[PDB]
Symmetry: C3
Subunit: 222 residues, 3 copies
């Protein structure tokens, strides 16, 4: 459309759609209950992202936020996506290593706090306070990354695949607060069309790339 970022929302929509259908077909036939869990979780993630990319593409998931005395285009639908998809991604990791339930609840809840405070930050009209929310969200993120690294006799296959996905997760997720900070939600140093591209690349990598690694491994089978 007239939104220069449309192309990246259209490509992200397509790529998440295609990944969803690929993982859907792929899990057909799986009967191993353990594998079934990883397929469900991992197919749902880009399915949800598909819908929220489409909602941005069609303009539904966009709102205007006044701050710095301008009308700032804020794509709120990203936060509806991440609210569900990031705990699911963490559940994939958590099930892989057979985490304690207390650790899973710590992780999902810290994640909720991460996304929810990112959303408040995204919609806050007092510019300096936006970054207070950014910082609290970032602290939740660092708690999560901490736990993925220092809170965890897995069969070697589990350990191997977990170590790869953990490294994928730390590197990609750590980029999100930077993109937000430099983009239109934060300091406005990078234009929205380039921010939207950055988040498209991260999201497809963190969802479809991550799931391709995971669903290809024997680590998911009993």
């Amino acid at each position: 459309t007239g939104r220069p970022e449309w192309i990246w929302l259209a490509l992200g929509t397509a790529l998440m759609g295609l990944g969803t259908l690929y993982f859907l077909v792929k899990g057909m036939g799986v009967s191993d209950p353990d594998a079934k869990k990883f397929y469900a979780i991992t197919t749902l993630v880009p399915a949800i992202a598909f819908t929220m990319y489409l909602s941005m593409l069609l303009g539904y998931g966009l709102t205007m936020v006044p701050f710095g005395g301008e009308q700032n285009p804020i794509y709120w639908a990203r936060y509806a996506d991440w609210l569900f998809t990031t705990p699911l991604l963490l559940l994939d990791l958590a099930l892989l290593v057979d985490a304690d339930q207390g650790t899973i609840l710590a992780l999902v809840g810290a994640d909720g706090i991460m996304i929810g405070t990112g959303l408040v930050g995204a919609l806050t009209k007092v510019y300096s306070y936006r970054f207070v929310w950014w910082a609290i969200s970032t602290a939740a993120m660092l708690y999560i990354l901490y736990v993925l690294f220092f809170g965890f006799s897995m069969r070697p296959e589990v350990a191997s695949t977990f170590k790869v996905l953990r490294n994928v997760t730390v590197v990609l997720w750590s980029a999100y607060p930077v993109v937000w900070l430099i983009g239109s939600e934060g300091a406005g140093i990078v234009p929205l069309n380039i921010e939207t591209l950055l988040f498209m690349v991260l999201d497809v990598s963190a969802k479809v790339g991550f799931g391709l690694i995971l669903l290809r491994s024997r680590a998911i089978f009993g």
Copy 2:
């Protein structure tokens, strides 16, 4: 009130209230943990619907959506209801057959996608796009119905009761996308007062009728 559909919202409120109190009294005394689960799930469903029917009745759960250059009355509270009640209904089925957790997560998540995209569709102001959301929601519904039919040594009692509730579920749930399509959210072929009646009959049947079948069966006891 001045809303011709008020009578059907009032009757639905009453019928969901009465079913809630009936199942509440009925489960008094149940000590079998397995039965306790089916009572909790099944009592909660019309309790939630009661509150959302009342919110429509009092006017809180109604908003105006501009599309086709008119101010279209959209009852959004139905989606808050269904967001919680339809996965609970699926959990009842899922527990009955002792489904794998991966299958339960596939089902709840597809359901979330179904209702959430129905909600986006209901609130979308570009008329043609409303039906894009309808179609995606319908595809999620067909996934769910698929799984209820082709994804599942139950004691005979389980199998019998499941087969009945599964048939109830496919027939009633499949009617919802049609009512939406022909009613005020979609093509506007049927007036809101008749749509509201249709959804009242479906909802009471899918909640109170379904639970009467289920809670009467010995299938719910260990």
Copy 3:
């Protein structure tokens, strides 16, 4: 600020922040899975409350509701807090006594209904109807309190600690509907600044006070 209630939102923010960091440090080193659960649940509760107290403090979690022909300041962020923190508090109790899953689902769902109907009540513009929602919410609360008292061979340590926390819970939670009723959401007999103080004292007691009791007990360890 210019909001006389700011001091109590600032103190509540600080006290919930400090309790969160205290329980965080405290649970460092716990390896007992059972204890890990109670720490996660119990650290998350004031963490969430911290964010929602800060959102009120900064003005984000405040909206104006027209009712009685005035513009009534309503802090909606309390309901986002409680929506998550009150079922977590109930989960702490429920895990302590090893409740049946059916009882946990009854409790979380009644709780959802309690907070959600409180929220509708808080945002309803027809003044008399506000108290219809109050009453339904209160009925959900009384169901919960009922179950905490009459629905439950625990090791003596469990029983002791549960009896204390149950008594803490009944007394503090029962005060919330009264504060709402007499305060700015309800009859307007007590000013918002005094209401905000009352809820600050209850919240800190029900979260940080409750968790101090719980996390100090050996009841949380296998």
